[PDB]
UniProtKB/Swiss-Prot annotation, chain A:
The lineage of its organism: Eukaryota, Metazoa, Chordata, Craniata, Vertebrata. The modification Phosphothreonine is found at residue 213. One of its GO terms (cellular component) is nucleus. The gene is RPL4. This is Large ribosomal subunit protein uL4. The modification Citrulline is found at residue 247. The chain holds residues 54 to 316 of 427 of the full protein. It is found in: Cytoplasm. The modification Omega-N-methylarginine is found at residue 44.
UniProtKB/Swiss-Prot annotation, chain B:
This is Large ribosomal subunit protein eL13. It comes from Homo sapiens. The modification Phosphoserine is found at residues 51, 76, 105. One of its GO terms (biological process) is cytoplasmic translation. Belongs to the eukaryotic ribosomal protein eL13 family. It is linked to Spondyloepimetaphyseal dysplasia, Isidor-Toutain type: An autosomal dominant bone disease characterized by early postnatal growth deficiency, severe short stature, genu varum, platyspondyly and severe epiphyseal and metaphyseal changes in the lower limbs. GO terms for molecular function: RNA binding; structural constituent of ribosome. Higher levels of expression in benign breast lesions than in carcinomas. It comes from the Eukaryota. Component of the ribosome, a large ribonucleoprotein complex responsible for the synthesis of proteins in the cell. The small ribosomal subunit (SSU) binds messenger RNAs (mRNAs) and translates the encoded message by selecting cognate aminoacyl-transfer RNA (tRNA) molecules. The large subunit (LSU) contains the ribosomal catalytic site termed the peptidyl transferase center (PTC), which catalyzes the formation of peptide bonds, thereby polymerizing the amino acids delivered by tRNAs into a polypeptide chain. It is found in: Cytoplasm. GO terms for cellular component: cytoplasm; cytosol; cytosolic large ribosomal subunit; cytosolic ribosome; endoplasmic reticulum; membrane; nucleolus; nucleus. Keywords: Acetylation, Cytoplasm, Disease variant, Dwarfism, Isopeptide bond, Phosphoprotein, Ribonucleoprotein, Ribosomal protein, Ubl conjugation.
Swiss-Prot record, chain C:
GO terms for cellular component: cytoplasm; cytosol; cytosolic large ribosomal subunit; cytosolic ribosome; extracellular exosome; membrane; nucleolus; nucleoplasm. This is Large ribosomal subunit protein uL24. It is linked to Diamond-Blackfan anemia 11: A form of Diamond-Blackfan anemia, a congenital non-regenerative hypoplastic anemia that usually presents early in infancy. Diamond-Blackfan anemia is characterized by a moderate to severe macrocytic anemia, erythroblastopenia, and an increased risk of malignancy. 30 to 40% of Diamond-Blackfan anemia patients present with short stature and congenital anomalies, the most frequent being craniofacial (Pierre-Robin syndrome and cleft palate), thumb and urogenital anomalies. Signal peptide: none annotated. The gene is RPL26.
Length: 263, 158, 134
RNA sequence: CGACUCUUAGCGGUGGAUCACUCGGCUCGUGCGUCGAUGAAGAACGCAGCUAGCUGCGAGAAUUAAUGUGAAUUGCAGGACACAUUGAUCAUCGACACUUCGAACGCACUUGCGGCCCCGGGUUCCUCCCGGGGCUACGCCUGUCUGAGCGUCGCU
RNA sequence: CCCCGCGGACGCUACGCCGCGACGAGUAGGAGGGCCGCUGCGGUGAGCCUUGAAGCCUAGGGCGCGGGCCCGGGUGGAGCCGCCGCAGGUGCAGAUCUUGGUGGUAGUAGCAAAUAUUCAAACGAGAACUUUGAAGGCCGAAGUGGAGAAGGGUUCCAUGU
RNA sequence: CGACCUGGGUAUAGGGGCGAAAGACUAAUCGAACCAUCUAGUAGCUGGUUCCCUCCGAAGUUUCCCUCAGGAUAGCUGGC
RNA sequence: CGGCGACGUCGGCUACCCACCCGACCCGUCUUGAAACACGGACCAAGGAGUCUAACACGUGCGCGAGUCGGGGGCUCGCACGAAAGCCGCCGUGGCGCAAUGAAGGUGAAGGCCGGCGCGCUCGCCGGCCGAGGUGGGAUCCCGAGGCCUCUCCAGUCCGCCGAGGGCGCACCACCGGCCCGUCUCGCCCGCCGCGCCGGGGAGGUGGAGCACGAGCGCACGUGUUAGGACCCGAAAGAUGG
RNA sequence: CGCGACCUCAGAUCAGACGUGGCGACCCGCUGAAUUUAAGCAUAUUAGUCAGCGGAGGAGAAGAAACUAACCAGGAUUCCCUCAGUAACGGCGAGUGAACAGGGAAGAGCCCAGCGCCGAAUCCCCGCCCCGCGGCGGGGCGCGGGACAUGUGGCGUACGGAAGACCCGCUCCCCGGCGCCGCUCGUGGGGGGCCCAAGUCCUUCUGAUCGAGGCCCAGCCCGUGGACGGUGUGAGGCCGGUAGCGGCCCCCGGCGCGCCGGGCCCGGGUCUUCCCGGAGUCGGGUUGCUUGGGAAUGCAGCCCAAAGCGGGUGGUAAACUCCAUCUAAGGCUAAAUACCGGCACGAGACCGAUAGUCAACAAGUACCGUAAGGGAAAGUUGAAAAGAACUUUGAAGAGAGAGUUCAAGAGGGCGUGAAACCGUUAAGAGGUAAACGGGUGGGGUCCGCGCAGUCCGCCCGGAGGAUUCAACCCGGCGGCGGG
């Protein structure tokens, strides 16, 4: 807020022997404003309580290792059909979830052939969902230039831009993303992993250089290896039903002993 | 009033600091402006190094850093003298000069003068008149082999 | 979408510019699509409206194939008045109904020196664009 | 039986809350970063066919010219305008013009009063009046002219 | 070694479900949960809506211990919300609180300083207050008279409402 | 009929003016005017301090303080 | 098991009015004590008060870990989003931590067992090993006599469970020692290019926010304290210029 | 006993210029508090801050060491990170508090006086002629005047310089014009102007549609354009715009080339001989302010007042002694940097009319005070005025009909229209002021598809229907197991 708000007034308190509250009142006379309250958060025209100020520390710095960790987790999550379908990305007739196409799509120039590519990859229902979800935002965002809202479509990832950005970018929901400059704000849209992604082949090959394997370290980063698991075998049901566990247990106590009436 | 254990603190906020607060919201815009000016200057001086003139090899002053070597302000007058360069021509050919620096050790003196000879051997000199070259350099040497250099000229390595 | 950093997309700014637009660009704002036959005869799609050309209303209460000549281009109200597109008021007399020019199609153009030149420039630019596209 | 009063509902008043709308702000960022004696900022007074304010403008007065655009402006009237023997409107604005105070400048102002130099009229060119035009502030630089000094001298 | 029968209920959002025992006051104060509520952002609902959004009204039906919520009816005419996270100028009975509006008081106090009015008529829809005339009275020349200064700035003067 | 009343023109300005003297007067303000700012001055003092349920749950006592309407400290409390 | 069921009745009360019985003083606030002859409150609508920043402390969540952190700069079509995001690594400068102690000059954290020698003189030269000592508890883990089985035994075969006792002992606790720095008391040796007003070393008390095989760094959230207008409103006053 | 020269002064409406005042967010030079904190208060702190005065520019100030250091040395200034809440200061209390080094951003250096040398080589003004006008320039001429030896210009400045010899290298500058480019370079450089894709396709809702369905062919059409706004709802295709190393026109600017014209003048190395510096200034004493600077960091007043192998600094006052460092008392200089005022723009997890600027509106307006100054309230008919014709009572206000509109139960302070309060109608009640909790009862308004009350799995029987079951054959697909 303006630091001058509520204070461009020479108001001073009336005192205490005049049967009115001790809030400062504007001096002068001959107008509605004279004698009215001022300088208070409770007074009409006075400044707010604790005027918000520009030095509020809007920005947060996140550890680089944590940021790369989040990127790795989002990349892993996009490869699970349960998670991507949980985001509602209409991946039903997609031939294979880590969808990779040849580099010929990097040379696309026209939205016509981009759309035809999507249709042959059976991803067009995602764009159809975006189209059916376009609507008007609820609330003051309409006044604040965020008038229209929509859903997120699939994310196209490219290695070299040879006009593919221009070929796309008129498809609602499509986010074009360079493989060496990946963004968590686009991979996990609202803080929830599992966004549908379409990879160019060169971008798919570059992933072992960008983030490395576990046998090797990442080469295109100065020092980064993939994070280690704290639990290799996560199949809890299979583990519990393994014979090694089953031999060490005691028998289940599956008889319910309720309260017995005292006759 | 203090309450239980805790550091005795002396905040320096008794002096109306609110009127003088430096906010850094124009930091990325400042970075972009600096980058654009860098690109414009490098574009202006096409074959010359973008970073600037060659700086000398210099040892750090105090006992904390004297094991380390950084770049200096300019080559000394004695270094120029024994390198055979006129002190009014070195700056035009792109050598920083620091007249107010005197040498105290022949080891550092030799390091700097060998650096100067190496730079002179690495230099490509366009003729003043493009049609008529007097003593500058060869046509095959400068027709394509002269290109802009990024980063420091012959960087200082510990 | 829009990429020019010097072109605003603010709703309030755009509305301010629209309602405070000077007359010479209010004319450009009050532009109407040509009929199919005119869009074929001339390689142009729309055309700013004029005093004495004949249109037909395509939306609202007065739709119809009737060809009515404009009699007024009320630029302050952003409307035009058409010959038989009128309405009778209570006292007996009649007035015209304001109609936004975007809700009509021009069927005949009031040709003079200037309109032909405007058509020429628009058709030339369209040819340039399509020949670049091919 | 009513009157009065209380409670609840329907409706009608008073009131302008709520909700929606927003040519307004606030905050940040960018690019320039430009007043004035060749008369600034500010003020005053005036200017529209019908106009008090707001806006615009300066006696050429809600504007002249020029250039771009190309049929209006509009609340009513009136009136041009073959739109090419050249053009309504709007915009741009480089030509022209820009009343009185105001650093404010002949003197002074809560009033008014001069002086010099040309031109025109009564005069019938000589000097009185009337009108028009141009000067008439302070400090300061360089030069010019006029000078002052029992200042220091030289000739006589 | 099952089988004339090929069959055999529910479950376990494991942050879930189920069982048993004991206990329940509470200011100042502390903590937990909130599928309590408000506003805006990132996702999400192939969400809702001009065959009717928000809002408001209701002797309509209900749910929850409660915060509150859902639905019906009416008005209204253009936007609104659920779920997962995010961020707050986020919850009012008080503050002789601020702003705005409204009551009782109350058709009450009051329209009581300087003697005073009355008759007829005119206009006019309308006369105790206008106008004309006739009476009766006051200021009584240090005036309730005639003019000015300062101040006011058109109040001056006709005509019309 | 006078140390008389009074208009107008001037002069004196705030810790100053002016006072036949009452701390009177200085634009309804005077034991120090008014205006704007420093200023959201400070307050151990007065008043207020906004949704629900669940659980736990006090102290007005020690010691020190220009300390006695307040603090620190121990004690009492809750949470992890 | 019975009765009753459509223009008349059946059931419904949160919700509307009325009646009756019992109970029932007006809320907020200061207070030992408020219904108070204590103060604020005529009514209604809207606004209205622990906020942000900085610095600590502790708890918790996350990443990496004797390291950690790019926050400033730079590099990447400059800019819809992007003022974002990504990268640097001979940009780790630097900050914090990995060392403490004394005013300072300065100094600066390894012991234990087994041997031959001097005098195993409360000790100097080594060797061999091991590598922070010892006591008492100490979750957990390990060994374990002895048992628990079938239609039965004369004879061992595979594994399960219970188990008196025994052992290794995590973290942590209490103590005893040991090492580092300061400072006292005592006493004797050693070194040598500078034989010195030189330097080094030991024993016994005692001071230290120490060592004794690291736990930190960064980010986030919560609570508490303080600086700031600082939960909101409030002086009598002071100063500057008019 | 006049006339000249010089000096020092004066006048002029003399010829030609310049200053003034404004803005003041940022900057520079001064002057300068108190509130406040210290739980009091006087040093301290607030604070060299507010207020006051002066002076600028697009940046200003600073700035090329009388420096930092003590190193194996660095090297103008300014800004960022860090040093560092540290050294230090402080009723050593509250509190205050830098600098060096290191890493970055940017990087650029220089000119006088003096010492000298060069026949004052120097400069201004006035005339005449020519080429240019664009910020008045050049060329030539003047026994034209003036400034100036009390010192103009050239060389030359601490980084040494100059003058002679010996040797070596001729190596090529600037300014203003003519024409032409690549034209300028993240894709013209800038400014201005005019243009550039595709549904108003079929059926339907509506007052209006921008809504809802549909458009076979891989899918109505464009998409380098699905930002935004307007249009009678909610529009990629109706319109303006949007994208585009899209088009065209005009104007403006620096870059190279060939020509022309003008100015323009020798550089380096070695040896010899010379020559070298800023004074009421430094420094000291004292005083007062200031600083982190503490036996005194800086500034200033006053008194004293220098030196030349000197002077200053070397963070504890002094003497002696060595070493290190720089060269004060003259001046210029871009970039990195700042910007709550101005012009023109873009954006937002901000506010949505008691909010957000005081000001969404004829707002610094109305109005108040003599004045300095104080300073409001105040948005919304409707898509379209289609703004209620006409009849009728009243004098009119105002009614009653009628009419417009989807709506006047939108009718000119006209979106919706809450509460408090009031009028009317209906129901109920009333002598312990109202109101409240618990428990019922009566009435009333609504709710229940209330009004003959269920259902559904197997079995029994009746009356009927049937792309008909099982078992096999063919084919497809799964699930499990196989050394
Ligand atoms: Mg406000
Ligand atoms: Mg809402
Ligand atoms: Mg650089
Ligand atoms: Mg009502
Ligand atoms: Mg004109
Ligand atoms: Mg006078
Ligand atoms: Mg004489
Ligand atoms: Mg109990
Ligand atoms: Mg309880
Ligand atoms: Mg609030
Ligand atoms: Mg309230
Ligand atoms: Mg409220
Ligand atoms: Mg309360
Ligand atoms: Mg009465
Ligand atoms: Mg009376
Ligand atoms: Mg009488
Ligand atoms: Mg009388
Ligand atoms: Mg009179
Ligand atoms: Mg009159
Ligand atoms: Mg007295
Ligand atoms: Mg008075
Ligand atoms: Mg306060
Ligand atoms: Mg106050
Ligand atoms: Mg004491
Ligand atoms: Mg009390
Ligand atoms: Mg109590
Ligand atoms: Mg009491
Ligand atoms: Mg009470
Ligand atoms: Mg009592
Ligand atoms: Mg009392
Ligand atoms: Mg009280
Ligand atoms: Mg009261
Ligand atoms: Mg009240
Ligand atoms: Mg970034
Ligand atoms: Mg380091
Ligand atoms: Mg530190
Ligand atoms: Mg132990
Ligand atoms: Mg110990
Ligand atoms: Mg604490
Ligand atoms: Mg003159
Ligand atoms: Mg105090
Ligand atoms: Mg106090
Ligand atoms: Mg005090
Ligand atoms: Mg003080
Ligand atoms: Mg000031
Ligand atoms: Mg000035
Ligand atoms: Mg400067
Ligand atoms: Mg300077
Ligand atoms: Mg200070
Ligand atoms: Mg000279
Ligand atoms: Mg120098
Ligand atoms: Mg629209
Ligand atoms: Mg649209
Ligand atoms: Mg179009
Ligand atoms: Mg374009
Ligand atoms: Mg409102
Ligand atoms: Mg307002
Ligand atoms: Mg009336
Ligand atoms: Mg309606
Ligand atoms: Mg209304
Ligand atoms: Mg009623």
């Amino acid at each position: 807020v303006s630091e001058l708000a509520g204070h461009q007034t020479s108001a001073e308190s009336w005192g205490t022997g005049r049967a009115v509250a001790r809030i400062p009142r504007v001096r002068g006379g001959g107008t509605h404003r004279s004698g009215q309250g001022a300088f208070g958060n409770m007074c009409r025209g006075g400044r707010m309580f604790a005027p918000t100020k520009t030095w509020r520390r809007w920005h947060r710095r996140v550890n680089t290792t944590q940021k790369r960790y989040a990127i790795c987790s989002a990349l892993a999550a996009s490869a699970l059909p349960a998670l991507v379908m949980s985001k509602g990305h209409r991946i039903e007739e997609v031939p294979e979830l880590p969808l990779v196409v040849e580099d010929k799509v990097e040379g696309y120039k026209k939205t016509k052939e981009a759309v035809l590519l999507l249709k042959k990859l059976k991803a067009w229902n995602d764009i159809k969902k975006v189209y059916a979800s376009q609507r008007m935002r609820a609330g003051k965002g309409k006044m604040r230039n965020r008038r229209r809202i929509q859903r997120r479509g699939p994310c196209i990832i490219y290695n070299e831009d040879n006009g593919i950005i221009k070929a796309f970018r008129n498809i609602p929901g499509i986010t074009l993303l360079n493989v060496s400059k990946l963004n968590i704000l686009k991979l996990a849209p609202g803080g929830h992993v599992g966004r549908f992604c379409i990879w160019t082949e060169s971008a798919f090959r570059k992933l072992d250089e960008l983030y490395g394997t576990w046998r090797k370290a990442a080469s295109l980063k100065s020092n980064y290896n993939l994070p280690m698991h704290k639990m290799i075998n996560t199949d809890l049901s299979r583990i519990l039903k393994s014979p090694e566990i089953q031999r060490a247990l005691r028998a289940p106590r599956k008889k319910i002993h309720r309260r017995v009436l005292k006759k | 009033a203090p309450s239980r254990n805790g550091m005795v603190l002396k905040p320096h906020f008794h002096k109306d600091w609110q009127r003088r607060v430096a906010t850094w919201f124009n930091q990325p815009a400042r970075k972009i402006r600096r980058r654009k000016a860098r690109q414009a200057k490098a574009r202006r001086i096409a074959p010359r190094p973008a970073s600037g003139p060659i700086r000398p090899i210099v040892r750090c002053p105090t006992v904390r850093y004297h094991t380390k070597v950084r770049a200096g302000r300019g080559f000394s007058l004695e270094e120029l003298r024994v390198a055979g360069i006129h002190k009014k021509v070195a700056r035009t050919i792109g050598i920083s000069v620091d007249p107010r620096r005197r040498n105290k050790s022949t080891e550092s003196l030799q390091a700097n003068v060998q650096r100067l000879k190496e730079y002179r051997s690495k230099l490509i000199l366009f003729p003043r008149k493009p049609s008529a070259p007097k003593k500058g350099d060869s046509s095959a040497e400068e027709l394509k082999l002269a290109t802009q250099l990024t980063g420091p000229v012959m960087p200082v390595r510990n | 979408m829009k990429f020019n950093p010097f072109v605003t997309s603010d709703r309030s700014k755009n509305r301010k510019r629209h309602f405070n637009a000077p007359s010479h660009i209010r004319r450009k704002i009050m532009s109407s699509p040509l009929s199919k036959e005119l869009r074929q005869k001339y390689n142009v799609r729309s055309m700013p409206i004029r005093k004495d050309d004949e249109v037909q209303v395509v939306r609202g209460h007065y739709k119809g194939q009737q060809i009515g000549k404009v009699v007024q281009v009320y630029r302050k109200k952003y409307v035009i008045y058409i010959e038989r597109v009128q309405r009778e008021k209570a006292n007996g007399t009649t007035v015209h109904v304001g109609i936004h020019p975007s809700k009509v199609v021009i069927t005949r153009l009031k040709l003079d020196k200037d309109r032909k030149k405007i058509l020429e420039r628009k058709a030339k630019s369209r040819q340039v664009g399509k020949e670049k596209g091919k």
